[PDB]
Structures are given as structure tokens and as C-alpha cells.
Amino acid sequence: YYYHARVYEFLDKLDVVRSFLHARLRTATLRHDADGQATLLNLLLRNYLHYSLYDQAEKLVSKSVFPEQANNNEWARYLYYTGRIKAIQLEYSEARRTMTNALRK
Amino acid sequence: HGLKGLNSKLLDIRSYLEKVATGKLPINHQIIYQLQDVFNLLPDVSLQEFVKAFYLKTNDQMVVV
């Protein structure tokens, strides 16, 4: 998946390819594979921000629970996007946090 | 353990004074004097003085911690 999205360009990839990532995102979520979940989540977040939609991604986070056992790089990818959208919405003081972690992790 | 202790003593004096006002309280002007002296010794006063003392002190504790 990390490559799949990557090369991709537009709708059929942002939209048609996104519907899949959310699909098995749910599937794997019930399958309890931490790594693949977190990765996929990151990919669709990155999609929202290749788009202009912060809100959709924000309320997306609102219904999200992130898992444990991770790869610190993916962990910082998350904390990065998180901090960012968290910032654009004006709330700074919690953005510094997630970005600081994006430096640590 | 000390706090529990305190609360006890205060009861004692309290309901006694009641017995003073009821339990045929004789007088004991020697006790009442001492109660007053307990009040007169009562540290008031989130005063601009104390508020600083404690403050200047707490910070010293922070540095050590």
C-alpha cells in the first residue's frame, strides 16, 4: 500500500483507491494487525491533505483509535499529519506536541 | 494520623461547650480564656505578607526538587 498510493495521481487514485484503503482499514481493524492499520490510516490522512480537507481528516481522527506495536517511522508520520491538521484548525499548543514527537520518534 | 487527631480534639471542646450551655456548665472561666487564646493565636490572613512568604519559600523547594 505504501507504494500503491505513492505513484498514483488523481481521483481514481485519490477516490477509488481511497475507498479501498478505508475498506480493509476497517477489515484489518477487526483483524487487529497494528502495522497495516496505522500505515493505511496514514495513507488516507495524506490523501485528505493532498486534498484540502482538514475537517474530514479531523473528525476522522475523532473516531480513530490508534494501535500499539508500530514502526517509529509510521508513528512519526502520524504525529506529523496529526500535529499539522491540529494546527491548521488554529489550535497550536497541542500541535507543537505531536510535531515534537514527530521529531523524537 | 495527626489530622485525624486534630478533628478529635475539636469535637471534644465543641460538645463540651454545649454541655457548658446545657450539661449544667459550671463556668470554668479558665477554659474559656484558653479557647479565646486559641482564636487569638489563629493565623489569619492570606495577607500580602504571608502570600509572599509561602510563595518565596515554595520556589526554594522547587529548585531543590
Partner: protein, 59 residues
């Protein structure tokens, strides 16, 4: 792990300026920092301190 990191980096960007920076890639650090700012002030001031006072001489 390093490879993973690299991959992450790639995804986050490429990048244009970042590539250039990488290509450029030194020096030290000394000890402490802040705030540099501009320069050519002191003598400029004196140059003016004269001028100022020279203006004040003109005064």
C-alpha cells in the same frame, strides 16, 4: 529500520530544495547562539554618532 525511515522521508517529499540541500551536504557551532541579527551598526552608529554630533555640531 533505516530503510523504513528513508521510505517515510520519500513519502513526505522528494524534495526540490531538500535535494539541493542534500547535494550541498560541515563546520562547527562554537557554543550557544541567538540573537545574531544584522551588523554594520556600531561604526555606522559612530559614523552617525559623528554625523549625529556632527549634525549636532551643525547644531
Amino acid at each position: 529500520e533505516k530503510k523504513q525511515p528513508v521510505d517515510l522521508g520519500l513519502l513526505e517529499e522528494d524534495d526540490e530544495f531538500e535535494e539541493f540541500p542534500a547535494e550541498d551536504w560541515d563546520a562547527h557551532v562554537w557554543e550557544d547562539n541567538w540573537d545574531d541579527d544584522n551588523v554594520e551598526d556600531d561604526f555606522s552608529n559612530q559614523l552617525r554618532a559623528e554625523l549625529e554630533k556632527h549634525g549636532y555640531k551643525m547644531e
